[PDB]
Design an enzyme around this catalytic site. Structure first.
Site, PDB file in Angstrom:
ATOM      1  N   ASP A 194       0.845  -1.186   0.000  1.00  0.00           N
ATOM      2  CA  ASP A 194       0.000   0.000   0.000  1.00  0.00           C
ATOM      3  C   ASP A 194       0.878   1.231   0.000  1.00  0.00           C
ATOM      4  OD1 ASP A 194      -2.522   1.075  -0.144  1.00  0.00           O
ATOM      5  OD2 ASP A 194      -2.833   1.144   2.012  1.00  0.00           O
ATOM      6  N   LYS A 196       1.787   4.874  -0.787  1.00  0.00           N
ATOM      7  CA  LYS A 196       1.003   6.068  -1.079  1.00  0.00           C
ATOM      8  C   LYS A 196       1.772   7.338  -0.656  1.00  0.00           C
ATOM      9  CE  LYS A 196      -1.904   5.156   2.972  1.00  0.00           C
ATOM     10  NZ  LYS A 196      -2.604   6.387   3.436  1.00  0.00           N
ATOM     11  N   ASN A 199       2.807   7.974   2.867  1.00  0.00           N
ATOM     12  CA  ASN A 199       3.936   7.196   3.369  1.00  0.00           C
ATOM     13  C   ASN A 199       5.262   7.801   2.979  1.00  0.00           C
ATOM     14  OD1 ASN A 199       2.114   5.339   4.541  1.00  0.00           O
ATOM     15  ND2 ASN A 199       1.988   4.249   2.610  1.00  0.00           N
ATOM     16  N   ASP A 212       5.680   4.694   8.041  1.00  0.00           N
ATOM     17  CA  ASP A 212       4.406   3.961   8.226  1.00  0.00           C
ATOM     18  C   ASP A 212       4.379   2.657   7.422  1.00  0.00           C
ATOM     19  OD1 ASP A 212       1.693   3.226   8.757  1.00  0.00           O
ATOM     20  OD2 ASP A 212       0.848   4.903   7.567  1.00  0.00           O
ATOM     21  N   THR A 233      -9.001   1.822   1.898  1.00  0.00           N
ATOM     22  CA  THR A 233      -8.786   2.823   0.846  1.00  0.00           C
ATOM     23  C   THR A 233      -7.996   2.168  -0.290  1.00  0.00           C
ATOM     24  OG1 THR A 233      -9.099   4.593   2.424  1.00  0.00           O
ATOM     25  CG2 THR A 233      -7.999   5.192   0.357  1.00  0.00           C
TER      26      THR A 233
HETATM   27  O1  LIG Z   1       1.616   6.370  10.622  1.00  0.00           O
HETATM   28  C1  LIG Z   1       1.270   7.464  10.230  1.00  0.00           C
HETATM   29  N1  LIG Z   1       2.145   8.484  10.022  1.00  0.00           N
HETATM   30  C2  LIG Z   1       3.513   8.485  10.240  1.00  0.00           C
HETATM   31  N2  LIG Z   1       4.242   9.557  10.307  1.00  0.00           N
HETATM   32  C3  LIG Z   1       5.521   9.404  10.624  1.00  0.00           C
HETATM   33  C4  LIG Z   1       6.504  10.525  10.721  1.00  0.00           C
HETATM   34  C5  LIG Z   1       6.094  11.881  10.711  1.00  0.00           C
HETATM   35  C6  LIG Z   1       7.073  12.878  10.781  1.00  0.00           C
HETATM   36  N3  LIG Z   1       8.368  12.568  10.876  1.00  0.00           N
HETATM   37  C7  LIG Z   1       8.792  11.310  10.913  1.00  0.00           C
HETATM   38  C8  LIG Z   1       7.889  10.262  10.841  1.00  0.00           C
HETATM   39  C9  LIG Z   1       5.880   8.123  10.842  1.00  0.00           C
HETATM   40  S1  LIG Z   1       4.475   7.083  10.644  1.00  0.00           S
HETATM   41  C10 LIG Z   1      -0.169   7.685  10.008  1.00  0.00           C
HETATM   42  C11 LIG Z   1      -0.969   6.668   9.459  1.00  0.00           C
HETATM   43  C12 LIG Z   1      -2.332   6.865   9.321  1.00  0.00           C
HETATM   44  C13 LIG Z   1      -2.917   8.062   9.746  1.00  0.00           C
HETATM   45  C14 LIG Z   1      -2.139   9.074  10.294  1.00  0.00           C
HETATM   46  C15 LIG Z   1      -0.765   8.891  10.430  1.00  0.00           C
HETATM   47  F1  LIG Z   1      -0.013   9.885  10.960  1.00  0.00           F
END
Ligand SMILES: O=C(Nc1nc(-c2ccncc2)cs1)c1ccccc1F
Ligand SMILES: O=C(Nc1nc(-c2ccncc2)cs1)c1ccccc1F
Lengths: 392, 388
Positions: A194, A196, A199, A212, A233
């Site tokens: 997945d 996207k 990610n 992610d 999704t």
């Molecule tokens: O997993 C998620 N986001 C991630 N953001 C980071 C990250 C952010 C900034 N700097 C380093 C790393 C790592 S994983 C996610 C999934 C689904 C919904 C909302 C989410 F925020």
């Protein structure tokens, strides 16, 4: 093996960061045990009650000494999901700045999904690649799993796309960085499934890193992966990952290449190629992609860009990437006079983040149920024993 | 600070006396896998997935760690309700030890003190614990083999002249003092607990009844502990209201030991077991010596000095008054150098596995729910975190 060998193999297993029986993994096992037993109903058992009494002061000392959530001052909530939220944090002592991903233990068992986080943990902790967001620490308690990663101040590609009508030269760069990043993941024996723009994160220099890895899975002897999981999704998912909802089929890494083509189409067109109002409508279009794939009349997208998209947006059997990355890399779409594959991340990125501080969150848009008391041993903390991880 | 926290936390996993050292932690996981792996419990998915996740891992650990199959059993030297004691040869190191097996099941129906004393006494008077390990059925204590056998065997095959009794009593006084100095009262001093090394010198073994003394070196115990012929009158009466006693109870047993070595029988023997208890209680009148021109003035005195009520018992004011006793007056040894002297009976041994001084020789039901039978034994292992 000699007695000395046997002793040292065992000793080195307690010290190995990749070991399932590392001192931190073992400490989890004990921490879980105390958590899942300390209830009045269970304490009726003397074996159980004496154990808890014996380890009371000890377990508390450990709990306080080990990395806890209160060691971090939360600066801002940068992301939010079903699992929990992503937040810009400052480690109170080291005063160091990280991004921390929280995963609700109750929300995982409730939803039955408890195993994805192992892949996300392993990938980030051990990729040692400029293409993967680094995990520095992983810790937990009775309520959450915590993943202390490096902060990516450039935000995600969703934010980039939402602020620009991307030129082809930029899309070429980002697609190339993605191909390299995915190859890195594939080389670790993993398929994302997945991929996207959500990610795709940008570092302080504007270069890509994947984050992610919740939908990631280890490939078998044949570089394949089966799956009896539901879809969330479908917009970027390959027809094969949709075709196999119930484990009725194995699929290889070529499924991530499909997502790459979608990412390209979206960057150049402005929408995903199979969008429909309903979720089920999208699935239908993805399935019917042979007919549903259309490009707008504005001859804005080049010959080679349209070709690369179609090379990726076909059935796996004839999909570009089936015979390795090199056939993707060799594509004429990537033919340019700015960068070489082997030196791309050493070049100057098309969008360089202008940041106010180590805690600048401008590239991130602004944005509790408990387990019941057991009437018998249920072991709610067991699916998480060994999640703790520290770096040296 | 962050580095302090890391250090404190690191030093805890290395400490041999820590409740959370590698040994304890490895014990816990092993206990968890053991107490969960049953068909009834595996119905729970949290439980079943955990076991499946840790299957290959737990087996690797189980194979790598010290297991009972690492030892070739040479002979069963002792047997007991608790379990058996056996002369063993560690297959790899080819090293020879005596291994004490304790049935986990038979216990649930004291070993922590026995483990601590032997592992950390660092005394020539205490049998050394090299390893302690376990499994789902037994606790294993790998000690140094004492080929001279116990004093029960010596007494049974010899008539002990006073000069020998003087030596053995002296060695016992020294050994008990060592135990007392560690803050313990043996609470069951008998010739069965007295082992002889390759050189014929004493080492105390089997600290089953050992209890840590309090601030004022006393022990409040509401129930009698020990053997019938050696039990002190105070530990015999030990009850609700009373209960409180000190190390002077072991000195009572030393006197019993002396009387038996010189006389040939215990001083309160009676046909029935209850008859012995009666005689112990009536020690003032029941203590008699046969018409034996061979029991010296000083030997008879030392016995009576020990076989009296605690309030006036020799030892009440420390070892030195026992040491100063005229019975120990001799021209062969000094207390300071006594274990460096030549013992009265030097074992003539055929090999490192000679067992001539040793006479010839069910578990838990399957849980219908989590019972945690291995939990009272987490930490028993003495292997990954030992003192050197
Ligand atoms: O997993 C998620 N986001 C991630 N953001 C980071 C990250 C952010 C900034 N700097 C380093 C790393 C790592 S994983 C996610 C999934 C689904 C919904 C909302 C989410 F925020
Ligand atoms: O506990 C007991 N014996 C012990 N023998 C040793 C030992 C033996 C040889 N060499 C070193 C040490 C240690 S403890 C016991 C008690 C009751 C009944 C049978 C027993 F065997």
């Amino acid at each position: 093996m000699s007695f000395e060998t046997r002793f040292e193999k065992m000793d080195n297993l307690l010290r190995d960061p990749k070991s399932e029986v590392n001192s931190d993994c073992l400490l989890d096992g004990l921490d879980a045990l105390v958590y899942d037993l300390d209830f009045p109903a269970l304490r009726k058992n003397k074996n159980i009650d004496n154990f808890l009494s014996r380890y009371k002061d000890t377990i508390n000392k450990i709990r306080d000494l080990r990395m806890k959530a209160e060691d971090y001052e939360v600066v801002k909530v940068i992301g939010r999901g079903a699992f929990g939220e992503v937040q810009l944090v400052r480690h109170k002592s080291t005063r160091k700045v990280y991004a921390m991903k929280l995963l609700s233990k109750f929300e995982m068992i409730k939803r039955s999904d408890s195993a994805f986080f192992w892949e996300e943990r392993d990938i980030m902790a051990f990729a040692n690649s400029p293409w993967v967001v680094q995990l520095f620490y992983a810790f937990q308690d009775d309520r959450y799993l915590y993943m202390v990663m490096e902060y990516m101040p450039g935000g995600d590609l969703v934010n980039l796309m939402s602020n620009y009508d991307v030129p082809e030269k930029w899309a070429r760069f980002y697609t190339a960085e993605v191909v390299l990043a995915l190859d890195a993941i594939h080389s670790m024996g993993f398929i994302h499934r997945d991929v996207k723009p959500d990610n795709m994160l940008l570092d302080k220099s504007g270069h890509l890193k994947l984050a992610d890895f919740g939908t990631c899975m280890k490939m078998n002897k044949e570089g394949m992966v089966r799956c009896d999981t539901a879809v969330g999704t479908p917009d970027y998912i390959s027809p094969e990952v949709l075709k196999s909802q119930g484990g009725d089929g194995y699929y290889g890494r070529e499924c991530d290449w499909w997502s790459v083509g979608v990412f390209l189409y979206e960057m150049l067109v402005g929408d995903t190629p199979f969008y429909a109002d309903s979720l089920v409508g999208t699935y239908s279009k993805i399935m019917n992609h042979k007919n549903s794939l259309t490009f707008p009349d504005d001859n804005d997208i080049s010959k080679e860009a349209k070709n690369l998209i179609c090379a990726f947006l076909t059935d796996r059997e004839v999909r570009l990437g089936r015979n390795g990355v090199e056939e993707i890399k060799r594509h004429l779409f990537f033919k340019n006079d700015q960068w070489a594959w082997e030196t791309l991340r050493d070049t100057v990125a098309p969008v360089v983040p202008d940041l106010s501080s180590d805690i600048d969150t401008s590239n991130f848009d602004d944005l509790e149920e408990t387990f019941p008391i057991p009437k018998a041993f249920v072991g709610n903390q067991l699916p998480f024993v060994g999640f703790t991880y520290y770096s040296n």
